[PDB]
């Protein structure tokens, strides 16, 4: 598979998976604003923000920081699995109202 994608920063990580900082290639505010909200509804996480470093280049940095219950690398794997279901429940509700009209 590919590896020009999400990539943990070794310089700004904890010794455990409690705190980390990932770097997303080729994704603008369209993803980072959506992915921020689906993570923050996890009761375990305390800090999850994103930013663009410089708008000429094209990369995103997502920050994740939680308590000692779950490792944060496991949290966004739950997090970005979780909005995949949220895309479905909008799609299912919408398409039945189209055919009914």
């Amino acid at each position: 598979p590919d590896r020009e994608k999400i990539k943990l920063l070794t310089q700004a990580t904890s010794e455990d998976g409690t705190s980390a900082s990932f770097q997303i290639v080729e994704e603008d505010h369209t993803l980072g604003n959506a992915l921020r909200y689906v993570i923050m509804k996890n009761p375990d996480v305390e800090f999850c923000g994103y930013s663009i470093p410089h708008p000429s280049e094209n990369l995103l940095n997502i920050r994740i920081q939680t308590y000692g219950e779950t490792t944060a690398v496991d949290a966004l794997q739950k997090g970005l699995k979780d909005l995949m279901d949220l895309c479905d429940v909008v799609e299912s509700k919408f398409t039945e109202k189209i055919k009914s009209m």
Partner: peptide, 22 residues
């Protein structure tokens, strides 16, 4: 959750499925 002491409105797809509407 984590906004007040009582952590309501946690994530639940079925409690969203009851409330979402088009």
């Amino acid at each position: 959750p984590g906004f007040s002491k009582d952590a309501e409105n946690e994530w639940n797809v079925e409690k969203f499925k009851k409330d979402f509407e088009v």
